Amino acid sequence: GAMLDVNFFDELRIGLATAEDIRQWSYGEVKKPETINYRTLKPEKDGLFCEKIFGPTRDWECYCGKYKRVRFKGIICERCGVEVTRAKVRRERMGHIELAAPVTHIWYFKGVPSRLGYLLDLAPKDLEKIIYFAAYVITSVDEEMRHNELSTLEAEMAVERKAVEDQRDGELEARAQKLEADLAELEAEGAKADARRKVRDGGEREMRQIRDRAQRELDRLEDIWSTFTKLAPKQLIVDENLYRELVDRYGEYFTGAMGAESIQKLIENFDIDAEAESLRDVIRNGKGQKKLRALKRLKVVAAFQQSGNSPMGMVLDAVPVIPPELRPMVQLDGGRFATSDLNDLYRRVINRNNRLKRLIDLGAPEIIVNNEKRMLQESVDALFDNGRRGRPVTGPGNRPLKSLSDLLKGKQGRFRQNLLGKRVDYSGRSVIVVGPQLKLHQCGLPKLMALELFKPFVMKRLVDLNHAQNIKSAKRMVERQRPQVWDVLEEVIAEHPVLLNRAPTLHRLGIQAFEPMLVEGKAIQLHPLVCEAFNADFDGDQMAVHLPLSAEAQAEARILMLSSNNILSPASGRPLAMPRLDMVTGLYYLTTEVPGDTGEYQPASGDHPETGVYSSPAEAIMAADRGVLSVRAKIKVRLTQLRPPVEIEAELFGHSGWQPGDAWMAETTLGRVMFNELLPLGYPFVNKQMHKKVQAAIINDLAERYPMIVVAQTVDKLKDAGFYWATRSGVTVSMADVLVPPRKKEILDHYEERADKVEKQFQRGALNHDERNEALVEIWKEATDEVGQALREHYPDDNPIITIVDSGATGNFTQTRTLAGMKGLVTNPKGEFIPRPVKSSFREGLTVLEYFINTHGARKGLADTALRTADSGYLTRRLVDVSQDVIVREHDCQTERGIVVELAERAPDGTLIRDPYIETSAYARTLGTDAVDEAGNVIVERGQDLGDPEIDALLAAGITQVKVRSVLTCATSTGVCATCYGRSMATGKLVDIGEAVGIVAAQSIGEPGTQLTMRTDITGGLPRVQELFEARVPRGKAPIADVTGRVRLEDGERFYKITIVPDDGGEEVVYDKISKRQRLRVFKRVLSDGDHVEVGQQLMEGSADPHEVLRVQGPREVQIHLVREVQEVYRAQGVSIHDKHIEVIVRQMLRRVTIIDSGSTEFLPGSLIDRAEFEAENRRVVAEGGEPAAGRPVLMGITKASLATDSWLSAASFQETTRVLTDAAINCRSDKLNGLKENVIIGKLIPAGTGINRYRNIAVQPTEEARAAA
DNA sequence: AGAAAACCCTTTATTTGTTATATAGTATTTTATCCTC
DNA sequence: GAGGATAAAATACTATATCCTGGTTAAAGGGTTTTCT
RNA sequence: CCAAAAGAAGUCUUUCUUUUGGUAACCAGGAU
Ligand SMILES: [Zn+2]
């Protein structure tokens, strides 16, 4: 394929490299541990920076100086040998080190599971002995020459043993003669007990010592014989002396080695087919741990069998050296250098190799040579992975060095740090402030930042306008900021979009494009109506500015990313550019009707006519300017430019409508006329007070029925009016506005008596500790509620605090009670309520103890957020990876499968009560079947968007369930289709044929984390979501039923015992160890003995594990289970996420199947393989005879599924880089470069959105009439 | 020709031995003990 | 009583949001070399 | 892509030619 790469890539292949490839990449051999000569500052020869090996340090300049001119090229100087070329080649040329002994690669020896110990069937514990010179290994044995010379040598060994034993027996006989002489001495002369006992003890001691010597020597020879007779390959001979005796006595019949060369010889004498066949037989028959070990072993053996690659690449004979420019040493001032920390590791290897090489030619004992080889083996291990075995090699300050593996792993590795995320030009950052004067598509950019980002564009116009002779003059002008650069700049930046970004970018709207304009200052001015999308308050936030350059990059920032084109949230479809806070207060104040205000309408009294009637809204604005009328007084006006409401338009104009100009009489306030003048012209007249809910309804109506530009302009006008009238609303905070409940003391005393009685009952022993606490807690909760109600009833309606609360602007009433009336019960560090409770408000001021017990829970709350901020991001990162390959590819798969939706179950007495969560499960879906009711014609046809009117029609017609299309049932091969996905929640129309729905789903699920409080053993928050998506076993696992029937329950001691009675009668299922600390489930009454249970009824109270429900009830049921369980948490936190996103993730969770019966297909039992591949392979196998493979659905987590991906590059960049790389190399995997991440890494256009062939190959041509007209 | 003050190299050794604030999850080797023949 | 098979425990590896700035970058010992007297 | 020196033309100060010269890892502290 390509060598220097021109981006004609089709594949990226990884595999093991042999020594012949390593010394084929090489341009030379490094054989001296030198880097640079400090005096001349020129690379030494045959060192780590030699110019002959790695190339010239200076462009077209050899080492000796004979050649210095460009004209010389492609020739190697005959004196210095340096090839005359460009110095850039030092980033490309590699050398190699020729090792004096073989050395293993630590990746295939250490990493668990050990892959050499699976290939050779050696436990790692004793493999470490072999490769580090701590034991011998038998590499070969002759097993027939043995048989023959073995009979012969058995005879010889018997001869030897008998001879030695006879010699020892003669020695014992001599000892016996000595004993007889001793007895002669004893009995001959006179010597009593002393001498007798002494001589006899000596004699018996000597006899026993001779016997012991005989026994020990016989045992040694017996060990020699026993070891020889049973000698086998791969046998570890510890006890050096044993091996020395064996090799001396029978040096033939076997060869034994030590170190990595022994493993090399073991691999050479290793046929890969017999091993594979044996492992397959053991799999088919063995069972138990033997089968579970053969299944693991067969993976690597099959990997090395299928491919043409050999396993000999595990043991190394040459080491490659990385080009110098990737491990540079740079001159720091003062004759000091900064090495790259790889030079030290290479120098250690070179030094050890040179010493070993010199110690071999010189001749030395085997001990010393083996010691040098062991140290050389340890040096290469440190070079490749420092610290994986033993103590890390440390540099200055006792800090471990950075090996080659460290350059690839973790957040600071090559992948995540440099390939997936980069630093870029034409950027800037600053602090953002509020830009209330801007339009929705504009931003304020300080002019010194703009002059720097747009430097090339201003330099061109300065020359083009003849303000500068050339580009250097224009550059000097821009650098010195002459007065005309500003006149050029404001023209240059016109209609050039700029990208603004705030970190963390949780969702899509964290980047948006605006139109820059110059402002005075150093802070970026941001529109107030984009802070909800950016999540940007003005307490010190900063944002980064990027600048598109090409024509496509500029069109994508105007047609795709412009701020005013993105008003709706892609997660749920709700508008995000609504008024909030001050704007809501201002709009709520304006459209309020104060009874008995200035200038109100007054009926005729009989002496004067009606008062308060105006001939136009321009006469009322003139009366409000005189103090004669109030903007919130009820009046009657004659409107001509505002469309009347539906009823008034029907009962006065009929015909077609008001047809602007026709006058009608309205009874309203001036503020409401002013508010309705801000809405479009054809919009009816809204006569209501603008609570935040009403504003949300209006802006949803406008977004549905009108284009985007109209909505953007309307929200801008609403912003202006809201700020203007919030300045005049009179909302301030003074302690005279914080009223206190008039009778707090009476309530608190009344409940103090109750608490006193409870305490006295406890003091009399009527109840234990916990019962008293529960009683006190109930009493004080009642007291808090009774104080809050009095507070609510005491405040007026025009108080600023309750006004801000009741307009929906911000805040709830619990915060008002805590500030004005009473705080109440507070929690422990454990979480249990303090029964005191706190009895003061923050207006009165808490005492010291109340403040302390309040801090108890305050800090718990702060720590919770501080620690969830990271878990949210980790979860989002995993969800983005699992589902990065779901893209809309077709328009219609034309399948008939689908899911059903609850859609307003029927009421008991008979009525259709709508299902509360219908907007997130039934809206924005397309029907799969037709809706027919009570023999009536099809109410709704197949394939319809199924919006609000259609749901209303279906409910009126009287149906409760519809079968809709879903991504869980899409029939397309790669990616979803458009009709199965349905409406796009952001656009409002059918999704496009390039949209990356997987990333949108991941960002929608994972963005509302942070605002997902962990809740006080069943998990109930972000941990619950994480364990749902990871398909873990729930903490509070609750068993489910397996078959219908009645249930017999024995309330045993220390644990329950439930057994299901099968109606069929085959077998009874027993659940033994169920803790009594749990509870029984209640469905419809607590679980009662003899009660009937369903096939999948949950018995205990808790969380069922998703794996069992899949095995019992099938895939549809587990899909329902997972979607419902995730939505339950999100609803409990009051977050609206449409179900199709969770359905995308769940679809990605259920792609594979598990192999139970291999049959004849090339699938190992227990492996997980893609379901489509499963069907294709079984189809290929039904031909050529019949032997289907048996498969079963499996459920995978978001990490296992994302690591089982078909691209080794994406999986290596996700997690576990070393393991993914080593097993990909062993399997010789090839990467097709078909995903988003893989194309991002190599720098190619992603296959999504604007980068697909349908849109990327458009052809534009003028029309013929336009050509003629010209 | 000998003595003193400034270079060049090595290496943080790895014992029959100088190293104790995480948890949560999974996966793979021991290992200990129990059950069977 | 011996062997095997299954729980148990014990180690081994992996992951934990984004952005910015400021201070440091080897010591110690042995052998040797060169200059001065 | 920039700096310095020399030569030529004009302007009273730009253009042409020749030569020379041209970073990271750790630890720590903050912010949203
Ligand atoms: Zn040369």
Ligand SMILES: [Zn+2]
């Ligand atoms: Zn489909």
